A paper describes a structure:
CCs are quaternary structures comprising two or more α-helices supercoiled around each other with cyclic (Cn) or dihedral (Dn) symmetry. Here, we describe variants with all combinations of the aliphatic residues, Ile, Leu and Val, at a and d to give four classes of peptide: the ββ class, with a and d = Ile or Val; Lβ, a = Leu and d = Ile or Val; βL, a = Ile or Val and d = Leu; and LL, a = d = Leu. Peptides are named systematically appending the one-letter code for the amino acids at the a and d sites to “CC-Type2-“; e.g., CC-Hept becomes CC-Type2-LI. In summary, solution-phase data and X-ray crystal structures demonstrate conclusively that different classes of Type-2 coiled-coil (CC) peptides—i.e., based on abcdefg repeats with predominantly hydrophobic residues at a, d, e and g—adopt a range of distinct states.
Specifically, we mutated the centremost Leu at d (position 17) to Glu to give CC-Type2-IL-Sg-L17E and CC-Type2-LL-L17E. However, unlike the parents, they had accessible thermal unfolding transitions. Both transitions were pH dependent with stabilities increasing sharply below pH 6–7. We confirmed the likely involvement of Glu-17 with a pH titration of CC-Type2-LL-L17Q, which only started to unfold at pH 3.
Numbering used by the authors:
A (entry chain C), B (entry chain B), D (entry chain C), E (entry chain B): 1 to 29
C (entry chain A), F (entry chain A): 1 to 30
């Protein structure tokens, strides 16, 4: 229903999370 | 959706955490 | 039901943790 | 059912999370 | 429980994250 | 259903983040 873009906005968050992690990993070298 | 409500709060918290990770990464360089 | 309530709490923990990381980041600058 | 101690083991995790945060906050002074 | 399965994976990840936060705290002192 | 799948992914992100924090902690020691 409208728990449907619940999951959509969470999927975006998870993606932002991944980009952020990648940047930190790269800083740790 | 109530449950949906929670998932929206989670997504927003996740984004903020991701942005904090980026600030950490930049402080390292 | 109680699952909803649990996920809200995870959300607050992540938010509080974000704040702490900003502080750490600032300390690492100087 | 046996999503019942699902939530129980998650409640414990959340508590560990809080203790960990408190210790970091205290280190940041 | 499958959904229950996920919640168990989450709890374990949360614990590991909490323990990493403590290691961070101790490194500061 | 798809909620289950989503929560699994959060779990992996938290696990990967934990590793990164251990590395940061080690770097802060020296």
């Amino acid at each position: 229903g409208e728990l449907a873009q619940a999951l959509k906005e969470l999927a975006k968050a998870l993606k932002e999370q991944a980009w952020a992690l990648k940047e930190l990993a790269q800083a740790l070298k």
